[model samples]
Structures are given as C-alpha cells and as structure tokens.
Target chain A: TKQITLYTATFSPYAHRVRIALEEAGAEYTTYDVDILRNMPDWFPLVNPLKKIPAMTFGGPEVPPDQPSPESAKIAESLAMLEFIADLFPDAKLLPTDPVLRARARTFMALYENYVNGQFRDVWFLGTPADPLLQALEMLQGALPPDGGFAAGEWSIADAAVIPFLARMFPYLEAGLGLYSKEDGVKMRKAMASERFARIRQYVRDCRARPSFANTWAGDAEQVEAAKTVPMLRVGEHHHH
Target chain B: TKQITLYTATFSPYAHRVRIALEEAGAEYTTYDVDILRNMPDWFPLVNPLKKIPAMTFGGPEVPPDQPSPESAKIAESLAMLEFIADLFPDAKLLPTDPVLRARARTFMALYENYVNGQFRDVWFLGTPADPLLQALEMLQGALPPDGGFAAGEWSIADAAVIPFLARMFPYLEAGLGLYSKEDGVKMRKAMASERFARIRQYVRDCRARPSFANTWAGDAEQVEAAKTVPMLRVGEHHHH
Candidate 1:
C-alpha cells in the first residue's frame, strides 16, 4: 500500500470530498488540517501550488504531513483525488463497473461542479440572489434517480463528491452563517424543506447515513463552527434582516 | 457494439472536445450538428433537458439523430462524454494506466474547466478583461509537463478537452472574433507571440498535428467562418479600432 497523506481544512467542502472517498475506499491515510483561510503554512504551496486544501501526497517514504517528501506524487483538486481513490482501490468498487452507469457517476459529478457549485459559492460568499441557487438545485435534483438511490444508483465517488456541499447548506442556513440576506435564507430554508426538494433532501440523509460520510464528517455543529472561522464569511457585515 | 451518437455543433468548443475524443477512441459513432443558437429543434430538449450541445446517446437502438430513442441512455456534459468514451474504449487507452498519471489527466481536465474555461467564455462572450484570461492561460500552461508529451505524458482525454479552446485562440484573435477590445486583442497577440507563451503554442501545434484533431477540426478558415454564425459573437456590434 502506498503512503497517503491528505492536507485538508474542515471548513472546505472540497477537502471534505476526498475524506469521504478515502473512507469509502477503506484506505489507510493521514489527514492534516491546514489553516488555509488564515494561516496557510508555507509548505502547503509545495504540495499544491494553488494553495488549496485537500492537497495530497502519495507513495513517498512515510513522512509527517507537515514534512512532505519531494518524491511523493503531489495531487491537487478534489475531483481528481476522488477519481484517484477509485482507481487505487478498485476492489472497493468506489465506482460502478458498467460503462453507462460509470458515465452516470461522472456526469453527476460534472453537473454538480458545473452548475451547482458556483451557485453555492456565490450565495454563501458573494450573497448573490437565492433564486438561481434554488433553481440550480432543482436541476441537479432532476438528475438523481426519481425513486431513491445514490447519484449513480450506487454509493459511488459521485455521492462523495456532492454530499459535503449539500450537507453544509442545511446547517449553514440554519445558523445563518453565509453572506445571503435573511430573506433569501428564509426562502432557501422553505424551498429546501418543501416537496420541491424532497428527493435531494432524502439523498443527503441517505449519504449521511453511510459509514464513509458518518466517519469523515465533523458533526453538523462542529462543521458550522469551523466555517465560522472563515474570514470570507464576513460574519457580521451582511444585513441579517 | 453499443450504438453511440453525439449531437454537436460546428462552433462549440465543448462539443468539439468530445468529437476529438471519439476520433481518438476509434469508436464507430455518428455526429449530427445542432443549430443550437439560432434554430434549435423542439425535440432537442428531449435528448438533453439542459439543451446543451454535445449530448450523447449510448446503448440505444440505432435511430436517426433527430429521432432519439427513449431507450438510449442520454449523457450530457462534455467532460462526462469524454470519460464515457475512455471507459468504453479502454484498448484505445484514452487514459493512462498508472493511478498517479490518471489523476494528472483528470486534474488537467478539472483545472481547465475550473480555472480556464470560464476565462475563455467570459473573454469571448462577456468581454471580461484580457489580463485575467491571459493569467489563467499562463497558469494552465504551467500545468503541462515541463519537458514534453501530452497532459499525462501520452495522448489522453485531457488533451482532447483542452485543445479545442487553445486551438481557437489564435484564429479567433487574428479575426478579432471576440468581444474583447482591439487594444486588449493587440496585447493578447503580443503576449501569445512572446516567449511567455511558447510552450502552450507548441502544445497546440503538437495536438493539432495528431490525426484525431486533424480529422475532427473544420480547419482555421472554415472554423472562423462557422463561428461567425454564432449570435453571441456580435460581429458588427463591437468597435474595430
């Protein structure tokens, strides 16, 4: 087995994505929390030139996370890491076996990243209008199996890629932790709870029930607390009402 | 073999990405051009609810492009289609075998989509500042192997995903096709010609030399002509000098 070390920050849904994939793969790995928002260590950039959390080091001599080896393959980007874990531990069946089903997994991940992620970011960080974010969520919900199952009809890495952000929306809204106005937050809360979003709501509950998510997620309260530390949230700057 | 059909457009880089991959995969497939911008058929949305070009049908009864079969699995998102092709045509080795190298391919695709694709779109369509787009391009160029070879040291879907946009930049700039100011276009022309962009320039040339790109591309003049039909280009609206 190769040595795997993940540099992560609790507040970043991007980092949380890989942690879930690792858990699903049942891979032994090390997690190092980086204070990426406020005190990113100098060496973090050597691991990921982008200086993003969820950077990883693989297959070098076992070293402490703080002291990354030059020889290990440094991999950045959360989606890349999720796919890597699936490739590394194929026996775990982190992805579906059939070609068409596999496309479903990849397609779901792409749809979320392309259409939904930006909305979440804009709503939380920039306080963009809530209607677009709600609409994007509905579009994403339409992609899921109309009945009940994971994004690909199995608990694949696709589920791992998305659950973190969706899971955060509830707690973040409940705590009013984002930059959105109080009116938008109420609108979001009502929209999410209504039948319009029931499928996705169930999807989140199903993913959270999985051991992979259960083990990797800092509890809702804990995750919200970590998010509170993010300077970009600009906690008190936005008008609450 | 499972039937594959790609609904594409002559001018869409997103659609172009998949056509290159299909050519590389040596897959027997059919392509049907959609006049998506000007005269989209009502039934087009049946195949892709998102109404995007490059939608695909897999494992369905062979049907004409206009008459897409409901039995066929509809796949949307260009990256998703790229991965699907790689999955279906493993012997073509659309991706590298080594786990780390495979991650490089996925990472390159994500980096392009996440960082660079929007810059290209915004620059061409929204007339965003050229400096930021140029910076993003430089960053993407840095991700390429310093020595040589494709994104993951051999031809992979990453190359297929990126080349269309990079290939368009030169011709588009020469024709002044985008919404960018003439001054910024001159700045861009100079920057691309300078040593700063030599590596990427070589990368584009190398990719274009491949049979897949050679076969799928509509040629410089032909493509510029086709791109002229795009309504968003706003050909006469922008000041020339």
Candidate 2:
C-alpha cells in the first residue's frame, strides 16, 4: 500500500479541500500541520517548491513528515490531490462513473476556480467591492441542480473542492473575521441569509452533513478561530494588494 | 452514440484547448464558430449561460449548432471540456493510467491555470509588467520533465491545456500583438528566445508536432489576424480594466 501524507494548515481552505477528498475516499493518511501563514519550514519547499500547503507525498518509505523521502511522488495543488485520491480509490467512487455526470463535477470545480474563487480572494484579501462576489456566488448557486442534490447529483470531488470555502464564509462572517468593512460585512450577512441564497445555504448544509466533511472539519467556532490567526484576515490590517 | 458539438473561436486559446483534446481523442465532433468578444448570438446563453466560447452540447439530437436541444447536456469551461473528452474516450487514453503520472498531468495544468495563465492575461490584456509573466513562465517550465516527453511523461490533457497559450505567446510577440508596452515586449521577446527558455521552446515544438495541435491550429499568421479582430487586444487602445 502506498503511504500518503498531507501537509496541511487548519486555516487554509485549499489544504482543507484535499483533506475532505482523502476522507471521502476512506484513505488512511497522515496530516502534518504547517503554520504556512505565520512561519513555513525551510524543508517545505523540498516537498512543494511553491511553498504552498496541501502538498502530498505518496508511496515513500515510512518516515516522519519533517523528513520527506526523495523516492515518494510529491504532488502539489489541491485539485490535483483530489483527483489523485479519486484515482487511488476507485471503489470509493470519489467521482461519478458516468462521463456526463463526471463532466458536471469537473465543470463545477472550474466554475468556482475561474469565477467565484477570485471574487472570494479579492473580497477577503483586497477588500474590493462585495457586489461582484455576491453576483458570482449566485451564478455558482445557479450551476447547482435546481432540485436538491450535490454539484453532480452525488457527493464528488467537486463538492470536496468547494465546500471548504463556502462553509468558511458563514462562520468567518459570524466571527467578523475578514478584512472587509463592517458595512460590507453586514451586506454580506443579509445577502447570505436572504431568499436568493437559500439554495446555496442548503447546498452547504447537505455537504456539511456528510461524514467526510464532519471528520475533516474543526467545527464552525474552531474553524473561525483558526481563520482568525491568518494574517490576511486581520480586521484592521491594510495590505498592499 | 452520443453526439458532440463544440462552439469555438479561432482566436481563443481557451477554445483551442478543447479542440486539441477532441482531436487527440479522435472523437467525431462538430465545431461552430462564435464571435463572443465582438458579437455573441442571443441563443449562446442557452448553451453556456456564461456566454463563453468552447461550450459543448453532448448526447443531443443532430440539430443545428444555433438551436441546442434541451435534451442535451451543455458543458462549459475549457478545462472541464478537456476532462469530458478524456472521460468520453477512455480507449484513447487521454489521461495516463498511472495515478502519480496522472497527478503530474493535473498538477501541470493547475500550475498553468493558477500561476502562468493570469500573468499571460495581465501582460497581454492590460500591458502589466512583463517580468512577472516571464518569472511565471519559468516556474511553469520547471514543472516539465527534465529529460523530455509530455507533462505527464506521455501526452495527456495537461499538454492540451497548456500548449494553446504557450504556442500563442511566441507568434503574438513576433507580430507585435498584445497590450504590453514596446519595452516590456522587447524584454519578453529576449527572455523567450534566450537559453533560459529552451525547455519551453522544445516543449512547444513537441506539442506542435502532434496531429492534434496541427489540425486544430489555424497557423500562426492567421491566428494573429484573428486575434487582431479582438477588441481586448487592440494594440493602441486604452482600457478601463
């Protein structure tokens, strides 16, 4: 059996994405917490030259997380890791078997990455206008099935890819844990609870109900606490970005 | 058998990505050109609500591209289309069989989308600093295999995902295209031609040698001509973006 180790940080939704996928796949994996925001280890780059978390080492000799084996395949990028977990555990059905349904899963992930993710980054990091981010979330909600179901009509890596961020939005907002102005934060809170966003709210609820999510999540309050430690989310801090 | 139709535009490297994949898959698919940037048809939203080219209709009745059947599944996002083609033609092995190698392919694509693609967009569309683009390009180049071959060892959708953008860069520079300043353009041209970029050059060459690329590409000059029609790439124009 291949040894799988996930280098993760509790504050990172990108790393959280892979953790959910591994759990969904029923993977026996190791997780090493890295304070990537405050202090990253020097050797982390040897595993991921980008110095990004959610890097993985697969099939090396049993070793400590700090001392990564050269022989292990170093896989970086959260979406790639999601796909790898799906590939390694076909029986877990991490992705849909049907081609069209599978495309839906893949498309949903792309829609988020290409459109919604940037809005999230801009709103949270740069404190740009929140209207665009709200519009983008509505568009993403439109992509979900009109009836109740996951992005692809079943729990897939697509769900694994997105829920971390969406789930964080509510808790983080409740905690007032982003760089956005209080006025904009109130706007976001009202918009999220409004009738227009009911589908997405249900979508988050359905995803959070899953065991994989339950196992990987640090709970809402704990997650908000972890997010508070992120330097980017510091309420009064001004960023050059 | 499921029918496949792809809406495409010659100037768009995004659309080109899917065309290359479809060619590689040897799928019998139809292409309909759309002038999305200049003149989008009213019905385009039916196929892709985002009104982007490279939208696909799969498993529909043999109907005109203008009138997409409700029975068909409309797929959006070029990367999603690439994966869809791979799923539809598993016998063609659009992705490698091995999981690690497959992760490499996915990681390579993610690296391009996450890092390189944005730099290309900023430089070409807004004429931002070219140094960042070059640096990003080098980072992408480092992801390739040291010796030779494709992104994942053998060719995969990863190659399809990237070659479109890389292949466009050389000719666009040669033709004095893009919104970048002349000074920055010269810097980019020198950087691309220098030994620092030899591997990417070869990688482009290897990908170009494939029938998949050859069939889909509209030649360098014609492509430039097509790109010239794009309002975004108007060399002398100033944008509010």
Candidate 3:
C-alpha cells in the first residue's frame, strides 16, 4: 500500500466530490488544504498544469515514486472520476453493476450537470438564468421516473455530483434573484425541495453522514458568512487545489 | 444482438462521435436524422424527453420486446450513450481495461469537452478567442507526453471526442481571429498535426474514410452554411449533454 495525497481547498464543490469518493472507496490518504485566497503555491501548477483544485496524487507501487503522477489515471471528468473509483474498488461500488442500469445513473448525472448545476452557476455567478437554463430544468424534471428511488436505481455518482449544486443553490434561492420575482424564486426553490428531490436528498444525507463528510463540511459556517459579503464570481478566485 | 436506432443531426459533432463509436464497434444501428433547426417532432419527446440529438433506443436481446420497455430504456445524452454502447459490446474495447489508463483517457475527453470544445465554439461563434479558450489550448498541449503519441497512448474515446473539435477549429483559425498566433494554440495545433496526432488522425481518417463519414459529412453542408448566417454571440451558445 502507498500513501495518497489529496490536495484541495475548503468550500469547493468539486473538491468535495473527490473527498466523498475517497471516503466511499475507504482509501487512506492524507489531506492537504491549499489556501486559495492568497497567491497559489508554485508547486500546485507543477502537479496540475491547469492549477485546478481536487487533484489527487496517488503514491504507491502502481505509481513510481518521486515523479508527480497527478494526472487522472482513469476518467477525467469529476463524475467520471467518481465512477472510476467505484469501478476500481468493487467493495465500494459507487455505481450499479448492470450496464443499462449504469447508463441510467450516468444520464441523470449528465442532466444535473447540464441543467441544475448550469442554472445554479448562471444565477449565482452570472446573475441571471437564461432560457437554456429553464429549458434544461424542465427537461430534467420530465426525465425523472415517476417511481423514483435514486437518480439511477440505487445511490450512485449522479447523486454525488448533484447534491453539492443543490446545497450551493439553496442560499442563492433564499437570497432571491433581482431579475426574477420573489414568487418565481420561491416556486423554484419549492420544486427543488420537493418529493422528486427527496431521493437525492437522502443520498446527500448518506454522503454527509460519513466521517469524511464531517471533515469536508466542517467549514460551512465560514462559507455562509463569506457568501454574504463576497461577490459570487470572486468566490473561486483564490481557491486552491 | 440488439439493433439500435440513433437519432442525430448530421452536422452535430456530438452525433458524429456516436456514429463513429457505433461504426468502430461494428455494432448494427439505424440512423434517424432529426432536423433540429425546425421544432422537434412529438415522437422525439416520447423517445428522449430532453429532445436532444444523439438519443438512442436499444432493441433486441438485452431489451425485452414486450411490457412497456420504453419506460425503462429510453436514453438521452451522447456521452452516456457512447459509454453504454461501449459497455454493451465489450468486443470493441473502445475503453481501456486498466482503471488508471481509463481515467487518463476520460480526463482527456473531459478536458476536450469542458475546455477544448468550449474554445472552438468561442472562436467560431463568439468572434474572438477568450481566456478560457487560450487556457484550454495550453492545457491540451501540456497534456501531450514528452514523446507524444495519442492523448492516452491508444485510439480510444478521447481521440474520438477531441478530433471533431480540431476539425471544427481549423475553419475558425482561418477565419482571422489570429487565434493561431497565440503560442499555445500554434504549438498544440503543430503537435496535433505532427506524427503524434497522425495515428489518431488516421483513426479519424479511417472513420471518415468509411461510406458513413462521407454520407454524414457532406450531407449537412447546407445546414452548416445556414448556421454561419446566424448572428454570433459574444460567449457562444452552450452545447452540453
């Protein structure tokens, strides 16, 4: 066995995904919190040339020592990486076994990424939700099976990818959008918190119940306070990997 | 063996990726071209609630012929469908067996989707290259190994996902944004056209060399011409699954 190091910053949805995956996989790894508010550390760019957060350095027999093997080994997308971890360690099994079943799981994740996540970013960061965002949400609501269990049968990566977006969006909804009426925002928020979202809510609950979740979500107080004063676009500015 | 029907728009790069995967996998599938320029047909919503191009319906052994199978099996999202097809027909081996290698391939594909594909659209539709476009190119160029070959050392889905972006970007580069004047874009294109990308280029060449490629590529010239007439946006229209 080799030691793994996960480099991440606090209050990052992307980093939280990786931390949850590590927890689900029961992989022992050290956590290095990089402070993004200050100037980025020189060493980070060396690991991830793009200098994005939530990058993992796998150190083991499989990875040669001394050399930085920071690049993703299997899937590159965050959702894909979640699946990759699930597939590699069957014991963790973050995804379902059946291919068709797995595809269903993937579809929901894609839908959330394109729709919910996209809308949240637009409303929070861009300050307005576009026509495409509304269309995407309408389509997403229609895509869900009436008899809902999880996004794709059992609890899976799609659930993992979506919950953070919901958590982040709740505050925005509470704050209200200047362009949209308060009633419309309230309606949207109710829909998001509806029975349809209950399955995902439970899934999020399960993920948060984990010890790693405690560690990752520990700083929510600070995040909420910061959200009150900082401009949304600038939130990610100093975020470290 | 299942007979699959792919509903696609001929000029869509997303559709093309699926077509290539099906052909490369040697899977038998029927193609249905949906004219997205016009309002989508009612039947399409029944098949894909999202009303997106590159949706598929699976028929045959894996899917039972009777008992409301449509409720269980309708799938949208191109990348999800691509993965489903690859998984359904393991013989094609489009994905890598090793988990780490698979992750790397996925990362490259994600980089293309999230970054490269986005940049190409910006250059084409936005009239000017943006910072994200430049950064995406730099990251892609940096991804190549010291002794570069394919992005992930074999002709896998990543190659399939990325080549279309290059083919599309080539036209925009000549459109006089001076995008290629940027060191990263120039260096990356040079690498792509070099011996490294040649093998993958040949894979694309072989893919397009097929009767399907000829049929699809030339079939949509009118649509491509029509798209050119539309007023370009400052940030380009978002196209994600």
Candidate 4:
C-alpha cells in the first residue's frame, strides 16, 4: 500500500481544512504534525516554498510518482489544495458537479479567504479589528443563500475550508473577543445562529464531532494557548458605523 | 433567445478581462458602455448593488426573467463573471484539466490580484512614479517559471486574467516611472515579449482587436488622457532584488 503523508500543525485552521477533505475523500494517509511555532523541518522548505503548514504528500495508485502526485504534490494554500484533492476523487465530489454551483463554491471560498478569513485574521492576528470585520462578516452571511446550508447544502470544499475558522472563532466570540465579540459581533452571531444559518451551524457541529477533529484539537492545545496571548487590537467599547 | 447584456467600460482592464473570456468561450452578449468617470447608471444600481461595471445579465437557459435569473445568477466582478462564462461552456475548458495545474493557475491569479495588481496600482495610479515598484514586479517575475511561457502555459484563466494588466502596464514601463521600466521590468517585459509569450501576446492583440475594446477606447478618450497626466510618486529607483 502506498503511504500518504500529511504535514500539518495542530491549531492551524488551514491544516484542519485539509484534514476534513482527506477524511471525506476516504483517502488513506499518514499525518505528520509539524510544530509550526517551533522551527519547521529543514526539508519542509523544499516541499512548500511558502513555508506554510498543512501540506500533503499523496502516494497512491491514482497519482503518478513521476508527476506531482499527492504524496509529492506539496500545496501551501488550503482552498486550492482542497480543490486539488476533490478533483482527485471525483466520486467523493466534495465540490458541486454543476459549473455555476462550482463557481459559487469557488466564490464562497474566495469570500471566506478575502472577507471572512481576512476579518478573522485582522481581529485575532493582525491587531486591527474594526468596521471592516463587521462588514466582512456581513458579506459572509450574505454569501450564504437564505436557506442553503454549509456553502452549497451538501458537504463541500467550501464547507471544509470555512468550518474550522468558524470553530476557532466561536470560542473567541463567546469570550467577547476575536471577530465574534465585537460590538456588532452580536448582530452577526445572531444572524449566524438564526434559522437562516441553522444548516451551517449544524454542519459546523458535525465537523467538530469528527474523531479527526478531536485529534487535531488535542494536538493543537499548546499552539492555541500561545495564539491566545498574541496581542491584537482591542475591540472598541462601541460599534461605530 | 434570451437577451444577455454586459455592462462595461471599454478601458477597464477588469472589463477587458471578461471581454477576452467571453470571446474565448464563444459566448454572445450585448455590451453596455458605462461612463464611470461621469455619473453611474441609475438602473446599474439595481443590477449590481456594488455599482461596478463588467456586470452581466444572462437571458439564456438558466436565467429567470423576473429577477434577472431568479435562479439567483447575477455576476458583478469581472473575474467572477469570467468564471461564470467558463462554467456555461465546459467544452471550451479554458481552465486546466489537471488539479495541480489548475491549483497553480488559481494561485497565480490570487497572487496577481493580491500582490501584482496592488503594486501596479500603487506605482501607476496611486503612488508617485518614484515609488518602489520592484517588490511588485519581483513578486510577479518570481511566479513565472524559469522555462515556462505563459503563467501556467496553455491559454488558461490565469493568462486571461493577467495579460490585460501587463498590456496596460507596458506603457507605464515605457514612461520609465513604473516598475516595469526598471532593469527587472525590462527583463520581465523581454520575457513577456519572448517567443514563449507569443500565444499570450497574440491573445492580447486579439483582445485589443475586438470591437468592444476599440469602441471602449474611443469612448474613454478623456479618462485615458486624464490617466496619462496623473502624477505618480517619485521615490528612489530600485534594481532587481
């Protein structure tokens, strides 16, 4: 049996994205937990020039050894890698079959990356959470169909890409920090918890319930703790338009 | 036949991007030139809440008349619209079939949008001509394969999305103030003009040859002239990093 080795960090939302895709695809692979906060492996630079975590090496029949197979195909960005994996397993079909739906899914991922994830990063990592975060969240909520669940209803690459971020952000929201606890955060969270997002919330719960997620959470504890202490811009006392 | 209308401003590189894609995908639609420099259209707000051009109305099979395709299909962004058009015509397969190749192509687009485009705007439109454009140009040059011709080879979406920007930037380079005029810019342009870029150059030529482009050029004469006279930042000159 060919071995599939996945290099990931415990707390990385991006890495968790790849884990969900791998689990859903039903592909067999080994997981190598890279301690990203610590020094990365010397060979890691060769694998992903970007030096980011959540890279995979797919070794299987479907992938050619000479070509950039999964095992050898080192991808840095999570969404792009998820699309690549979904393409490898068409039957799994994590993305929608229809082109328009597929485009919608891609746009969702883009919005997530540009708006949702961008807002989250600004609030949590970059120390610059402001109206932009609220605006970005509203855009995300808008991207969802009034009734569609999990970024295309069925389990999809978009869902996999976004859920981890939601999971991480939820804790921050409850604590009244991160992206969710901002002054307008309540309005946004209310929207998310609303019936319109029922399916999406359910999807996030299901993803969190996964055994792999447990492993990922357990492994990422230290990093998550470290991440919590990182200084970010304090949310203003009041939300300003 | 449904009446497909594309609201565009000919001089917009973004609008030009969709024009090339529509041409390549062999999709037929009417063009509505929007004079963005002056007042925007009244109905335009109804069509695109964002009030941006390169918005399209699909009167074809999937479109619903009542709400501009109540199927909820209205695309505003140029790249998003291009993807929609590509989806409508799968046989054209403007995107690469291989997952890795497609991922690479998408990554190129992301990098171009986030980095290259920003640099061009900063150097040409926003900042003084003296501003450091090396970082942007170097980033772009880095993305190009040492041996490959186009961004991903073959006429893929990445090429379609990026070529127009390069075409627009070439004149700025010639003005000796933009990043492209630097030694690195000179080399990169040479590479672009090389035999490898023949197809892409041809694609650009073909796009410029279109009636849409010609008409837009004729109509936007004032803005074009105004753009040429816009002052740029004057920073210390830089060389290849």
Q: Compare candidates 2 and 4 on lDDT and give the better one.
A: 2
Model 1, span B1-241: residue lDDT tens: 8899999998999999999999999999999999999999999998999999989998878889899899999999999999999999999999999999999999999899999988988888877778889999999999999888889999899999999999999999999998888888899999999999999998998999999998898999999999999998888545433
lDDT of all the models against the reference?
0.92, 0.92, 0.61, 0.63
Residue-level lDDT tens digits of model 2 in B1-241: 7999999999999999999999999999899999899899999999999998889999878999998899999999999999989999999999999999999999999999999999999989888888888999999999999999999999999999999999999999999998888888789999999999999999999999999999999899999999999988876853332
Best by DockQ: 2
Query: What is the Å distance of residue A209 in model 2 from its true position?
Result: 1.2
> Per-prediction TM-score, please?
0.98, 0.98, 0.77, 0.74
Segments in model 4 whose C-alpha atoms lie over 4 Å from true places: A1-4, A58-71, A175-223, A229-241, B1-4, B36-38, B60-72, B121-133, B173-241
Local accuracy of candidate 1 as per-residue lDDT tens digits, A1-241 = 8999999888889999999999988899999999988988988888999988889999989888888889999998999999999999999999999988999999999999999999999889988889999999999999999999999998899999999999999999999988889899889999999999999999999999998888888899999999999898997766443
lDDT by residue (A71-139, candidate 4, tens digit) is 455555676678777877889888887766776677677667755676677555544545576566666
TM-score of chain B of each: 0.97, 0.97, 0.71, 0.69
Candidate 2 regions with alpha-carbon error over 4 angstroms: A237-241, B238-241
Q: Backbone collision count in every prediction? A: 0, 0, 12, 14
Candidate 2, which CAPRI tier?
Answer: high
